[PDB]
Nucleic acid binder design. Structure first.
Ligand code: NA
Length: 262
DNA sequence: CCCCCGGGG
DNA sequence: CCCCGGGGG
């Protein structure tokens, strides 16, 4: 529903003035728009108290899902602020995956910083990142060997179409011990758990947007996202070689490079 | 040219 | 899963 707030944002971003054939600009605009949607809902304590009410059913659903993923009670929040994240630096694996942050201040003056990764998509799965095999292995803790080479084969072929049924089962088998680290590193750039560190997102916010309009939102903390992917990857088909991520290729550069959707 | 944000069938 | 595109820096 184009609520009062969303109606305002769609107007500020000139969405309705964009020809329908301008898909590229539309996607880019919608992306920035939905990041801003979160920033405004959590702009200040006044906004948060306002939106977490039955007077704004949609923003209440969004704000409640965010607090729920953090196991935080609205009544314990004394102050809130938010902002776009632009550090202008890179770390092991590239630019940090943090799109924005929300800081909550509690009664005893303590606070919690919540780095966020925000995306919009018409699908359940969307590109989360692209990396070279060596970068992944370095971040996940995989050394030279059969595992690294099978991953490299996937990168070079740009799919698993040339793997023999055996090789596919073999990759899945060797990756099993690294499943969690692989997933966590792919979406946060850190293999081990992180919390409140601006360089690594703590929550993954996914807005489902179809035909330019809001449909729903899903907000998961990293632990839950990993559990979900692990469960998905454990099924008979062993999606993503057990990782639950969809392995494919990045078309952006000359070099063979991997892309992961999740 | 590379990287990030996306999608079709 | 496999095959790909728009656009900014
Ligand atoms: Na941002």
């Amino acid at each position: 529903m184009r609520t009062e707030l969303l109606s305002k944002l769609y107007d500020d971003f000139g969405i309705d003035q964009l020809p329908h054939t301008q898909h590229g600009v539309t996607s880019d605009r919608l992306g920035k728009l939905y990041e801003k949607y979160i920033l405004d809902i959590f702009k200040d304590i006044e906004s948060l108290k306002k939106y977490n009410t039955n007077a704004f059913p949609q923003e209440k659903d969004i704000s409640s899902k965010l607090l729920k993923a953090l196991n935080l009670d609205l009544d314990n929040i004394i102050d809130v602020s938010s902002s776009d994240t632009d550090l202008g630096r890179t770390i092991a694996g590239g630019s940090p995956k943090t799109d924005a942050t929300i800081r909550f201040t509690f009664h005893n003056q303590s606070s919690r910083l919540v780095p966020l990764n925000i995306k919009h998509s018409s699908k359940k799965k969307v590109s989360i990142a692209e990396y070279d095999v060596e970068t992944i292995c370095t971040g996940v803790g995989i050394s030279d060997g059969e595992l690294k080479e099978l991953i490299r084969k996937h990168q070079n072929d740009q799919s698993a179409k040339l793997f023999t049924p055996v090789q596919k089962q073999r990759l899945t088998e060797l990756l099993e011990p690294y499943r969690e680290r692989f997933i966590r590193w792919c979406v946060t750039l850190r293999a081990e758990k992180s919390e409140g560190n601006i360089l690594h997102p703590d929550l993954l916010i996914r807005f489902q947007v179809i035909d330019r309009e809001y449909v729903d939102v899903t907000i998961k903390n990293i632990d839950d996202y990993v559990s979900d992917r692990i469960a998905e990857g454990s099924k008979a088909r062993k999606p993503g070689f057990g990782t639950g991520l969809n392995w494919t290729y990045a078309s952006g550069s000359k070099a063979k490079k991997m892309q992961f959707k999740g």
